Amino acid sequence: GQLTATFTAGKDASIVMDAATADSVEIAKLSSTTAEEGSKIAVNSLTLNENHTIPFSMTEDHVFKVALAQLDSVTQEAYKSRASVVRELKISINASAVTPSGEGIQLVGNEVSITLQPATTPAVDPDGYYIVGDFTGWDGNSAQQMKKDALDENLYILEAEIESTSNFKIFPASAINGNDIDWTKALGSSVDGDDSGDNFVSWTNAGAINTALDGKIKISFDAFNYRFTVKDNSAPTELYMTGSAYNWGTPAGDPNAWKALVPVNGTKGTFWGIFYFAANDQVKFAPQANWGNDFGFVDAISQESKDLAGLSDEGGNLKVGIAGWYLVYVSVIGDDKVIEFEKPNVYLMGDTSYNGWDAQLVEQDLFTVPGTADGEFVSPAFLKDGAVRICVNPKAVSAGDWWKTEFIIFDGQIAYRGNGGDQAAVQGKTGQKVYLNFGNGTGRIE
Numbered sequence: 001g002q003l004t005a006t007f008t009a010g011k012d013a014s015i016v017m018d019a020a021t022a023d024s025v026e027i028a029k030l031s032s033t034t035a036e037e038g039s040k041i042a043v044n045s046l047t048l049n050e051n052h053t054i055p056f057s058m059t060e061d062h063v064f065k066v067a068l069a070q071l072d073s074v075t076q077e078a079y080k081s082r083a084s085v086v087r088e089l090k091i092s093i094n095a096s097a098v099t100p101s102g103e104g105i106q107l108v109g110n111e112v113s114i115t116l117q118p119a120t121t122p123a124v125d126p127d128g129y130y131i132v133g134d135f136t137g138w139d140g141n142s143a144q145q146m147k148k149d150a151l152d153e154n155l156y157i158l159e160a161e162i163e164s165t166s167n168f169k170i171f172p173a174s175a176i177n178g179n180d181i182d183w184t185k186a187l188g189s190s191v192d193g194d195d196s197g198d199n200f201v202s203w204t205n206a207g208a209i210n211t212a213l214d215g216k217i218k219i220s221f222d223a224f225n226y227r228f229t230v231k232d233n234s235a236p237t238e239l240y241m242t243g244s245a246y247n248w249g250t251p252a253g254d255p256n257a258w259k260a261l262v263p264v265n266g267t268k269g270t271f272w273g274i275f276y277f278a279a280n281d282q283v284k285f286a287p288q289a290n291w292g293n294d295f296g297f298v299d300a301i302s303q304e305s306k307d308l309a310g311l312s313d314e315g316g317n318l319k320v321g322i323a324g325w326y327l328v329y330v331s332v333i334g335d336d337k338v339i340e341f342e343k344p345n346v347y348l349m350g351d352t353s354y355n356g357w358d359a360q361l362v363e364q365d366l367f368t369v370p371g372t373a374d375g376e377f378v379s380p381a382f383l384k385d386g387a388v389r390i391c392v393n394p395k396a397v398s399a400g401d402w403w404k405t406e407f408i409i410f411d412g413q414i415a416y417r418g419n420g421g422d423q424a425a426v427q428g429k430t431g432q433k434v435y436l437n438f439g440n441g442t443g444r445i446e
């Protein structure tokens, strides 16, 4: 008994905001229906790209109108971007026919498409961007320059540490001449004192953005999408893992219940360890050897990791599915967490290794991996007398920075470099090799 409707794209199908003259646009039209003559049309929902609504009106001829400014707003939200790029909008109208008794009968109709291009954004300032706010002092001399990210050239960053929350604005370099700031040239938020921490940048009578946080923060500015975030930039200085295999952390402080990870050198909130996991072991991590601000399964885990180790979520615990030795890599800055499981590749480096310093992190310099939960990684026998160096190298760390995660043996213990400088040299002789028990924390050269 089912009714159909046919919609078509309205006459304003290709909107260029720079050029747009009207304050309302026609975006769609009901062209025909199999509903009887005399029926009224009611609109149960009008959505854009599936989950966005917008105020709308419908004319006597069943043309659907919206305010251009709100269509433009909704388009920029949908795409999280003010970029001046042609954006597709898919319009879904769910309508009903209404009889003289008031009964609504559902129309099954199609979707239609239009596009809209947001207005031209400011030019990128060749000399970059500055932050000025309560925390700096509102003047040219106090303005702090944002760092242009090496990987993404649209992205500018400032890390700061502040005593209380702060209002601030972003200025292009050309707005600032000596101590003088041209206030008319601010970039900021739509609302003065916006405390969302994550919103659009405005270039038109911009208000001040509020940090919403204090302490260590990071202010990010995307000068292509024109968006900003302000994020908690503090990080744990230590990190510990407990587990089903460790009595779930009882008692507190016990090196028996809590395993320290090793800080990555000079690298905020990032840690690593080499650990044995059985199948179905569950673990969680904490910033001390005890429960509190602990975490387990999180969202930023590689598909790689998940495949390599068979990882899954088990009531918020992290569950390891495939037994084995793994290099565990963990990063925590403010709220953002990353956990990676990787091959436990330990490498001989330097003078006692293959072609010396000249081939680094190569297959020959790889330590054999034990099958047991208490065996020993063993290096390739030394090719020469020289100083022994040993490392891992996580994906996230460049090969040049192998020394950020290096260690050695002193007095039959594994001594991690961690955040410290070069370790005291330890000599080996030709045909010797290293033995590591990561379960014990002990080792030998022999």
Ligand SMILES: OC[C@H]1O[C@@H]2O[C@H]3[C@H](O)[C@@H](O)[C@@H](O[C@H]4[C@H](O)[C@@H](O)[C@@H](O[C@H]5[C@H](O)[C@@H](O)[C@@H](O[C@H]6[C@H](O)[C@@H](O)[C@@H](O[C@H]7[C@H](O)[C@@H](O)[C@@H](O[C@H]8[C@H](O)[C@@H](O)[C@@H](O[C@H]([C@H]2O)[C@@H]1O)O[C@@H]8CO)O[C@@H]7CO)O[C@@H]6CO)O[C@@H]5CO)O[C@@H]4CO)O[C@@H]3CO
Binding pocket: 134, 138, 167, 169, 183, 186, 192, 193, 207, 208
């Ligand atoms: O919650 C704490 C305070 O909140 C409010 O203070 C904020 C703002 O909300 C925030 O935007 C930002 O302010 C920045 C501006 O963003 C930045 O652009 C720059 O401001 C310059 C203006 O842009 C220029 O237009 C020019 O301003 C003129 C202004 O147009 C004139 O009207 C005149 O401003 C007078 C006011 O008229 C007076 O009423 C008086 O305002 C006092 C209030 O009386 C106080 O209650 C208090 O209010 C604060 C909120 O405004 C809260 O404490 O302080 C204001 C003054 O800040 O005095 C002002 C100034 O004498 O003269 C202005 C020129 O002097 O030039 C200004 C640059 O001076 O800098 C602003 C910061 O200084 O940050 C704040 C503070 O966190």
Ligand SMILES: OC[C@H]1O[C@H](O[C@H]2[C@H](O)[C@@H](O)[C@@H](O[C@H]3[C@H](O)[C@@H](O)[C@@H](O[C@H]4[C@H](O)[C@@H](O)[C@@H](O)O[C@@H]4CO)O[C@@H]3CO)O[C@@H]2CO)[C@H](O)[C@@H](O)[C@@H]1O
Binding pocket: 248, 284, 291, 292, 294, 315, 317
């Ligand atoms: O035999 C006892 C139980 O064994 C298993 O429970 C484990 C959990 O699976 C582990 O996750 C862990 O629980 C921690 C928890 O992870 C940690 O957050 C903290 O819990 C806080 C919680 O964050 C807070 O919101 C509030 O509710 O207080 C909680 C503390 O009570 O501490 C937990 C440990 O106390 O360890 C337990 C074992 O103790 C198994 O899943 C259970 O069904 C079983 O009963």
Ligand code: NA
Binding pocket: 348, 349, 350, 353, 354, 355, 356, 357, 358, 359, 360, 361, 362, 365
């Ligand atoms: Na080598």
